[PDB]
Design a protein around this nucleic acid. Sequence first.
DNA 1: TAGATATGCATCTCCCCCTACTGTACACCACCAAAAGT
DNA 2: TTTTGGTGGTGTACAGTAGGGGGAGATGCATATCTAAC
Length: 854
Amino acid sequence: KPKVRELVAHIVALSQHPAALGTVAVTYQHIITALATHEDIVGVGKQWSGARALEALLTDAGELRGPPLQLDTGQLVKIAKRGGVTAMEAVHASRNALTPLNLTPAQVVAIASNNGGKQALETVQRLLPVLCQAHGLTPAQVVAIASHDGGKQALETMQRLLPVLCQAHGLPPDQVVAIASNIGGKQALETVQRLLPVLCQAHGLTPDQVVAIASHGGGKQALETVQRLLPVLCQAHGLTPDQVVAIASHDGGKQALETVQRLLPVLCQAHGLTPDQVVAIASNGGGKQALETVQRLLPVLCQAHGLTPDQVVAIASNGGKQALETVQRLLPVLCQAHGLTPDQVVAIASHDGGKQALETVQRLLPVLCQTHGLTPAQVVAIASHDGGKQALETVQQLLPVLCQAHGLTPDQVVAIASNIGGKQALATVQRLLPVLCQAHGLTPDQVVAIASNGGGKQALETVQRLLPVLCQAHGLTPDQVVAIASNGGGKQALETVQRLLPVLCQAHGLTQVQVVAIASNIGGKQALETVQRLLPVLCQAHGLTPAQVVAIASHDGGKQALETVQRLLPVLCQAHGLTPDQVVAIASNGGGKQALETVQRLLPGLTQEQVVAIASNNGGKQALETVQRLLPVLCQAHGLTPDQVVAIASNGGGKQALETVQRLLPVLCQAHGLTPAQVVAIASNIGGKQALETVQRLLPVLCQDHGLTLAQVVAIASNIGGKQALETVQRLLPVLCQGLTQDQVVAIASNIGGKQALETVQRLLPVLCQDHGLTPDQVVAIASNIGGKQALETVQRLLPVLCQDHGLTLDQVVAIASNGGKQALETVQRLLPVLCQDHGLTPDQVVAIASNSG
DNA sequence: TAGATATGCATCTCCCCCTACTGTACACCACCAAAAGT
DNA sequence: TTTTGGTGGTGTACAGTAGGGGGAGATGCATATCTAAC
C-alpha cells in the first residue's frame, strides 16, 4: 500500500508515524524511549551515523536527567544532528575536562555541533591556551573558529600562517580571525598568501578589500574569480575596482560575479536596468539566484501585476529568488483577497526575510486582525522588516500576555514589533519590563520607547547593566539615559558615553547636558569619538567654540558632518566666502556632510544668504539638485520668480514641495482660482507635497458641500500641517456646527496645529460649558491661538486653582489662555506669590502681565 | 573497488544589529507692522 | 496708544527611507581512510 511517488524488518511504513522518510541511513528502528519532536530525531537518523547517534544520545541523556549534566535538550539533539555519534562520544567522555576550564555549554555545543565535531573539540582543548598565551586571543574568538566545520583545519592553518601574513603582509590579528572564522577557513588563509599580492601589483586592490573578500565561506573561490574574471567586466562592463570587489565579499561570491559576466549585458540591453542596479542585485547572499530568477520574472511581474522594474528590482535586491517567486505565487491571493495593494505587498517582499514573511502574513492576517484586534496596515507594517515571520509570530504569542502582565496597550505593541528585532525586543521586553519599574524607576512608556525604536534588546540590556552605574559619578538624570537608549546606535552610544564623558570635560570642559545631547542620535558612538579628534582642530585653527561643534554634532549622523567641515570648511571661505558661522549652519541638520558637499559642488543666479538658506534643512542636498533641475522649468509656468521657488525650497520637504508644485501648479487652477501666489503660499511651507496634494484631492468636497470658500480653504492649507488641518477639518466640520459656527471652526483650524486645536475642542467642549462655566465663544477664543489644544487643556487643569486657591476671575484666565496661553497661564499661577512677597507689589498689575508697570 | 565512516568546503536563505540620510507636524517666541479703542 | 495679525526663526518630536556589517542553519557535493561484501 504504496504511499506513492532498495525500503527494507518492516517495509518502511512500520510504526506509522510519518511519511517524513526517507530517512536513508537505511536505518530505522524505533525503538523509542522518547525523552522530542519527530522532526528532530528524524532529522538525526537522516545523517551518516544516525542510529548510533540516537543510542549514544541515550547514554548521555540518561547521563543527563539524573545528575548535573552541563546541557540543555534540543541542544543535545543539535549535538547529535550535526556532530554525529562521534562528537557525542567525545562529549560524555570529555565533559568534566571542559567543566579545566575551557568554555561555557554555550560554546561547547557550538563546536561539537558540526562535522569536525570530535576533532574540533579535542583540538581546542589542545590549542586554546597556546592561543590566549603566545598570541593573546580569547575563549570567545577561538571557539568562534572551531565553531564551524573545519575547526581542526581552521585552528591549525591559523597556528602555521598567522605569522607569514603579518611578517610579510601585515594584516592586524583581528583581521586573520575574520579570515579563519568561517567554513573554508583554511582555504581562505591559504588563498590569501597565494594570491594576496599577485593582484595588488597587477590590479590595485586595497589590502583590506581582499581581507574582506576572504571574510566569508568561499574565500578560495572569491579571489580566484576576482583575479581571473576581474577584467572582462572592468573592460567591457567597466565596473570600478570596489564594485566588482563588493559583489565578491559575500558567501557564494563566485557565482555572483560569474552571473554578472553572463547576465549583466543581456539584462539591461533588453531590460532597462542600470549597471549600478545589476551590481546591487548581485551583491547579496545568493545573488546568482537573483540574476537567474530575475531574467525569468521581470516581465511577467510587470505584465500581470503591472509592477515597476524598480520595485521588482528592489524586491530582487533583498528578498531574493524566494521573494520574487513567493510574490509570483501570492500576488493575487493577497492583494486581491485580504485588502492588500501590490505596494504594501512589495513593501513586505523587499527585505531578507522575503518569502518567510509574505507567507506568515497570508496565514496570520485575520488570526491577528479577527482576534487580537489589528488592521491589515499595522500587520503589513510589522511584516516589512528583515525579521518578519519572527516579529509577526511573537506579536501573536505575546500581545495579550504583555497587555495583561503589566499594561502595555495594543497600538503601542505594534510599535515595538515594527522594526528589525521585533522578537528580541519583545523578548527583552517581557524579561526586563518589571526589572525597571518597581526596581529601577523607569515607567512603562519610558521603556516601550526603548523597545519601539531601532535599539531593541541590546539597548534595554545595556540599560540595566549600565544605568545604575552611569549615575555613580557621571550624574545623568534618567531622563538623560532613557533618551540615549532610544536611537539606533543605542547600545553603542551608552557605552561610548561611559567611555568619553571624562575625555570631554577633562579636556573640553564640555557640560553633561551638552553631551547627553550627542549620545541621543541615530549614530551616537560615531560622533563622540569623531568630536574627540575634530574639536581641538576646529576651535583652535578655524573658528568654532565648543557649542558650534556640539551643535554641528548632534543629529543622526554627527560623524559625517564634523569630518566634512575639517575637510571642506576652509575652502568654503577660501574660495566660497560663506561666513564660517553660516557654514557651521549648512551642516547641523541630519543630512550634514551631504549638504556641505552639495554647496561646494553646486553653488555656481542666486546669493549666499539665499543659498546657505536652501541647504540648511534636511532637504539639503536634494534641495539644490532639484532647484537646478526645476528653477528653469518653473519660472515658465504662470508661477514663479527667482525669490519664490527659493522660499518654496528653504524648507524640509523641499524636493517634495517643488516637484509637487511642478506636477500640480496648473491642475486645480482649473478647479479653483489659485493665483500661483496662493499655491506658492501652500508650498513655501513644511510638508508642501502633502499640503498641495491634499488641497487638490479635498478642495471639491468642502466648497461644494460645506460651502467653505476658496480663501477659507487656502487659509487652512497654508499653515504647517495642511494635510492634517484639512483632513481633520472636513472630517469634523459637519459635527461642530450641529453650536459652533463655520468660520469659528475654520478660524481654530487656520492656525498652525489646527488639527490638534480642533480636536481638543470637540473633546473638552462640554467640560467648560458644564463645570466652572464658560461659553462656546470664550472657548473658541482660546482655541484659535497657536496656543490651541494646549492652552485649553491647561485652562481646565487650572480653572480650579487660580480662581479658588489664588483668587482670579474666569474672564482674566481666558484673557491669558487667549493671550499667552499655557506657559503664560501656569507661569502667572506660579509667579504671583513672588512679586507680592519680597518688597511690596500687587496682583493688579500682574494680570495679564500688564505693560510695565513699575 | 563499494561504500561506511568520518570530515572538509561552498552556497543559499534568513534573521539580527548599527549607522546615515530625508521628510512631516507642533509649539513657542520674539520682532514689526496694520488695525483699531480711546 | 492698545489689539491683533503676520513672518521667520528655533526647538523638538515623530515618521519614513537606505544600506553598512555579521552570524546561524541547511543542504548538497567533495574528500580522506578504513572496512567489508563482492
